Amino acid sequence: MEDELYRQSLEIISRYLREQATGAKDTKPMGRSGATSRKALETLRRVGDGVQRNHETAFQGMLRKLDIKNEDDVKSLSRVMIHVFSDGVTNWGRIVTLISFGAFVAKHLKTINQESSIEPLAESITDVLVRTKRDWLVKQRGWDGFVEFFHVEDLEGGHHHHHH
- Burial letters for 118-155: b for 16+ Cβ neighbours within 10 Å, e otherwise? bebbbbbbbbbbbebbeeebeeeebbeebbebbeebbe
Q: Which residue, judged by CB position, is nearest to ligand N8J in the bound state?
A: 97
Q: Does 82 bind ligand N8J (CB under 6 A)?
A: no
Q: Which residues contact 79 (CB under 8 A, 6 or more apart)?
A: none
Closest to ligand N8J by CB, 30 vs 128, is 128
Number of residues located near ligand N8J, criterion CB under 6 A:
11
| Least spacing, CB of residue 101 vs ligand N8J, in Å | 6
Residues 89-118 that bind ligand N8J (CB under 6 A): 94, 97-98, 101
Name the burial class of residue 57, with classes exposed (0-12), middle (13-18) and buried (19+) by CB atoms within 10 angstroms of its CB: exposed
Q: Which of 7, 45, 55, 151 binds ligand N8J (CB under 6 A)?
A: 55
Comparing CA positions, the residue from 7, 8, 4, 25 lying closest to residue 16 is 25
Q: Among 2, 3, 58, 82, indicate the residue that binds ligand N8J (CB under 6 A).
A: 58
Residue 149 is a binding residue for ligand N8J (CB under 6 A): no
Q: Which residues bind ligand N8J (CB under 6 A)?
A: 55, 58, 62, 66, 77, 80, 84, 94, 97-98, 101
